Symmetry: D2
Subunit: 261 residues, 4 copies
Amino acid sequence: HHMDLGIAGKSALVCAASKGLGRGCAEALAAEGVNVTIVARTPETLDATAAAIRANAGVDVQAVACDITTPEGRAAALAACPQPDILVNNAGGPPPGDFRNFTHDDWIRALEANMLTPIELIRATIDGMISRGFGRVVNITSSSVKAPIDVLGLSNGARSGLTGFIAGVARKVAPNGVTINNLLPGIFDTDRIAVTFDAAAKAQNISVDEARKQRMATIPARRFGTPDEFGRACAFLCSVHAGYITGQNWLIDGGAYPGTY
Amino acid sequence: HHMDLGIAGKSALVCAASKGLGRGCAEALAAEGVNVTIVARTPETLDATAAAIRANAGVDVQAVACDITTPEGRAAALAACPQPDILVNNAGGPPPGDFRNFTHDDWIRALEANMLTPIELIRATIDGMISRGFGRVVNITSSSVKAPIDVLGLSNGARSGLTGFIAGVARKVAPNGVTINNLLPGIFDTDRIAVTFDAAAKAQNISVDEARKQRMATIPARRFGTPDEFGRACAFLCSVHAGYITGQNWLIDGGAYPGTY
Amino acid sequence: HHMDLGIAGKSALVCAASKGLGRGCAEALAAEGVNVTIVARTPETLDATAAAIRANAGVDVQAVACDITTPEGRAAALAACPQPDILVNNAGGPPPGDFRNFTHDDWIRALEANMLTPIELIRATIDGMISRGFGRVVNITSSSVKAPIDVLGLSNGARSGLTGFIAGVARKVAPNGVTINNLLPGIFDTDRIAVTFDAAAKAQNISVDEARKQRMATIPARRFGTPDEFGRACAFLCSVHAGYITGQNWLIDGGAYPGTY
Amino acid sequence: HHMDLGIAGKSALVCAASKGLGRGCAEALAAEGVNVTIVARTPETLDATAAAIRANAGVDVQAVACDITTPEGRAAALAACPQPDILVNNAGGPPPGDFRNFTHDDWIRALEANMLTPIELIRATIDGMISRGFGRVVNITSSSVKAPIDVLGLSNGARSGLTGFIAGVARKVAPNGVTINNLLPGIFDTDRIAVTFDAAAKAQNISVDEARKQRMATIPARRFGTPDEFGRACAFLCSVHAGYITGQNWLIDGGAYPGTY
Ligand SMILES: NC(=O)c1ccc[n+]([C@@H]2O[C@H](COP(=O)([O-])OP(=O)(O)OC[C@H]3O[C@@H](n4cnc5c(N)ncnc54)[C@H](OP(=O)(O)O)[C@@H]3O)[C@@H](O)[C@H]2O)c1
Ligand SMILES: NC(=O)c1ccc[n+]([C@@H]2O[C@H](COP(=O)([O-])OP(=O)(O)OC[C@H]3O[C@@H](n4cnc5c(N)ncnc54)[C@H](OP(=O)(O)O)[C@@H]3O)[C@@H](O)[C@H]2O)c1
Ligand SMILES: NC(=O)c1ccc[n+]([C@@H]2O[C@H](COP(=O)([O-])OP(=O)(O)OC[C@H]3O[C@@H](n4cnc5c(N)ncnc54)[C@H](OP(=O)(O)O)[C@@H]3O)[C@@H](O)[C@H]2O)c1
Ligand SMILES: NC(=O)c1ccc[n+]([C@@H]2O[C@H](COP(=O)([O-])OP(=O)(O)OC[C@H]3O[C@@H](n4cnc5c(N)ncnc54)[C@H](OP(=O)(O)O)[C@@H]3O)[C@@H](O)[C@H]2O)c1
């Protein structure tokens, strides 16, 4: 038994996807027959992930080595995948800090990476989607837009800016068979959080395993998220069964956010 | 290809499901190998839907003819399906009117059908789900909990009451592999909205098609929702790939609700 | 200086107001020249509060000793104050417990007290406000409608039901110079709370002062709310300066709720 | 009667305040005895409004002619008012347009004016507020953060970015007697909307008065907001009676936004 998402043979541009949540989305789309173009900066891991997906899924896989948060990187991605049916927006997130230490340049860099980059990729791909009467955009954001994360003010700001803009464009382009939705991760078991736990353990004189355990104990689901399950939610949003879902912020966080809505 | 939801052979109790959104949920779950018990008041339609799901899905189908908004009906449903892995809560919705004409009996009827009935079925099934380390509850509610519907004050109130309570229990039971989420329909093309469009077309002296087209033009997606796609979202929430999603209100409305969140 | 709220000589019906937040609202309204009818069950305390407001504010004060959560109590309150310009809805809160121990009648009782009671008082007073082109309704609810409180499922449900219904009525009656808003307290230093901390101190063999300080340490403002400041926010909503505020949920909680919105 | 806000003799920096909502905030604070420093680019209207507030309120009024969205302008404002107790953040909003015509520079300018400028003024004033154990920051934003405005994508984005960041800093600084809240205008009767209706009428073959009338008819309160009542709400947030309100988004829109929350 398995659910046909109806997107085999379509094309997807999956940003920041040699590892982690982006990789999970690329894998899940390829599993459903989507030809995927994956983007990341470092060739070694990018080429390896592209080869793995090729050998596991049997779809066409393209790899673009670029910084997606530059105009030149966006142009390189679109040169490889010029008319995507499906766009998964993603890029590395901003550094932590106390708000009094954020510089103007820190703000601009976070806004470029996690707000203006997704917006520009939508701008560059939306006309083709509209012309074909089908389109799916999924933006990987953060629980930070629902409840601010203490040390991640740059995310609290930049990703909330993206989300507020997305609300408008989602409803504007909805008449044309295009949906635009955001996937908001709680804590997911990737290399990104291992850096955070490594520093937290060393500061607290406990093991990383113990620090991870203590964090899990505060999550209602009592675990971290997996890149696999994140990618499956992405694939569902990109399917022919989610065409009546647009402008939505899907929080995938094990219940950690306490708000009713 | 096709995505394996991992719930073949599980049991679901699907309330108010001979027609409409409930039937869509039952069929989508049966398509993934779930043995479904479906509940409705009218035996003829209920038996015909049960027979159709048997013929199409090949799963075990039980049909319980009862009023799910009564304790005798809830007991009869649970007697047939006493340890469901999956509970889909649903019942008929309240009648329209101006708030100054709502009677006390009106309020109790709406609160019983669309708040206390789902709560009682959760109370009666949660301990078995917890003991097995797996459970899925999906409550069919309404866009009325995000933005009040003019003439449906009884829904605006009763379903918001359910949602506020669900927020707490979803997080309370999450440590045990149980998730509880709400699916909020916008306008879906069922028999319930045909009653509204027939009375509109006849009153205004226009065709039903014209009356429906006027409403569609106000929806960003420019169509109504289908019971099939509603059921597919339900099936995803009930899957092994949605275990990190709980306490969430999933609005499926073609972008009609204008709020950013 | 001092801000003239423009409501001197108007009439207010203030429910559940011999003590606590309700008394704070009655005193703040009376300080602005509003003639207040205050309602509580216990005559001794009610009369003492009524006499203190008379002495300090110099307005007309009526005391009605009744149970506002019954139809007979509402009839008595409205007989004494049949055409209020201002209605402050309030009642005792529901008891704590685990949802598996809520009886069906526990739910009915909480729904009657904290949802249907304020709805019926609005229905009985809204026509007069509309006919005069001025009206203010303020409903005392709870932070429980923004984030569920663990042991207060009955509040999480009933007050959320009220709130969803209020959303519709507020926008329905806004053309007639009537506003309807909700005031959502976080933890406020009333007798209800003082009893709770007496139990915590005794259970832990610590002083009441230490038990209270333990809770304050988790609140961003690092204190509890005062009934006075709650009443002042109520009075501002009831003023001629808040006529463009309706359907709003004002959370007054020292930042304790972590959600962005 | 009249309510004492307890802020006579305190100092406020009120940005973008020779006209409109900013002027309304400055006048309301001055009316409660606050010494106000008002900032605007054009000297003619700035000096006239400063003279009016001096004559009306008898407080100290400083006028700074500068563009508050530049570092040099922020520095000039702070030179005049180096240790404000109260900061009202405000600046001119972004131009309208279709999202496909927004340039990278359009985005940066909107982000600078309506997100990074308020953030930098908070960073420059928060230390002193904390050191005195009292502070009030009110950010004038927009209903666009609750529901996107069709042609104002630059606002939908930039002001949502501010709001997501403010959520974190409000809770961070709350232990020190500082509150940070946002005031979200719906449509207010200022010079800003005259330009909007001047274009809306010129294209619709109706008068600006007719276009205004038709827009009013869609607002539940059936009118536009006044700068006076907006300023009064600002003054209440800045008072000693609002110290338990922080991190809140106060929507002042006559009920036009349809969302329950
Ligand atoms: N993990 C969580 O708990 C969590 C939760 C919420 C939000 N997030 C956010 O979700 C996003 C993905 O996080 P993750 O945990 O999946 O991180 P991850 O495991 O480190 O994966 C990041 C991936 O993106 C690529 N990448 C990063 N910046 C890029 C850029 N500018 N251009 C192109 N490729 C880029 C990386 O490869 P290269 O380094 O070779 O480019 C890698 O393939 C981040 O924005 C993160 O802040 C994460
Ligand atoms: N359609 C929409 O646009 C929409 C949107 C939001 C919310 N909703 C809500 O979603 C729910 C389902 O609506 P729908 O459009 O699917 O309606 P529908 O097409 O009329 O189907 C309702 C189903 O529920 C059954 N049912 C009704 N009352 C029952 C009861 N007391 N006990 C057992 N079964 C009962 C009906 O069969 P019997 O009559 O034989 O019992 C039928 O099988 C309602 O609460 C509705 O208000 C609908
Ligand atoms: N304090 C908080 O932290 C907090 C926070 C959120 C919500 N709330 C809610 O706010 C409401 C007021 O709480 P509070 O802290 O102000 O309580 P409080 O200090 O105990 O005052 C309650 C007042 O209401 C009266 N009352 C209670 N039940 C009544 C009834 N059936 N009919 C008429 N009068 C009635 C009481 O007098 P009699 O006993 O003589 O009738 C008393 O005057 C409650 O619903 C509470 O749950 C409180
Ligand atoms: N009116 C509404 O319906 C409405 C609703 C929601 C949001 N808003 C937003 O609220 C803000 C205020 O709007 P409003 O209606 O009050 O406008 P307004 O009547 O045109 O007043 C704007 C004031 O700000 C000053 N100003 C503008 N940009 C400035 C800058 N960079 N530096 C310093 N002073 C500056 C202007 O004077 P100078 O030109 O001489 O500098 C003037 O004193 C805007 O961001 C607007 O988009 C307005």
